[PDB]
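User: Just a sanity check before I run the rest of the batch. Below are the structure tokens for the first item. I only need the designed sequence back.
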């Protein structure tokens, strides 16, 4: 859905395995948090610019065993994974910084030189 939702520890474990050879960005989110509404929109734009990268969301309160493992006490928290290892983290709704970390970890050539903007 641009940003697929992971609904259980089992699905998360499988996802990490499936996506081992590429970058995976996980937005730990809450459906009541305006921070996360802002950042889901950012994640959807990233997802279009970087189809090599997997962008998913996981409801922190809905999968609490995963949240506890990864020390998720607030949302948004973004975790970055390659080969089932956490390689980076961002706490809070900081759009430019999310994008900077994604660009740092994404492969060279993963994006075109420009992105279309909506000017209204």
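Assistant: Here's the designed sequence for the first item:
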């Amino acid at each position: 859905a641009a940003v697929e939702e992971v609904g259980s520890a089992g699905q998360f474990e499988e996802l990490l395995r499936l996506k081992a050879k590429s970058l995976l960005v996980v937005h730990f989110w809450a459906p009541w948090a305006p921070q996360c509404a802002q950042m889901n929109e950012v994640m959807a734009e990233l997802a279009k610019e970087l189809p090599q990268v997997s962008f998913v969301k996981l409801e922190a309160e809905g999968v609490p065993e995963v949240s506890e493992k990864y020390e998720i006490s607030s949302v948004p928290t973004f975790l970055f994974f390659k080969n089932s290892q956490k390689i980076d983290r961002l706490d809070g709704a900081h759009a430019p910084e999310l994008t900077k970390k994604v660009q740092r970890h994404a492969s060279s050539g993963s994006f075109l030189p420009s992105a279309k903007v909506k000017v209204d």
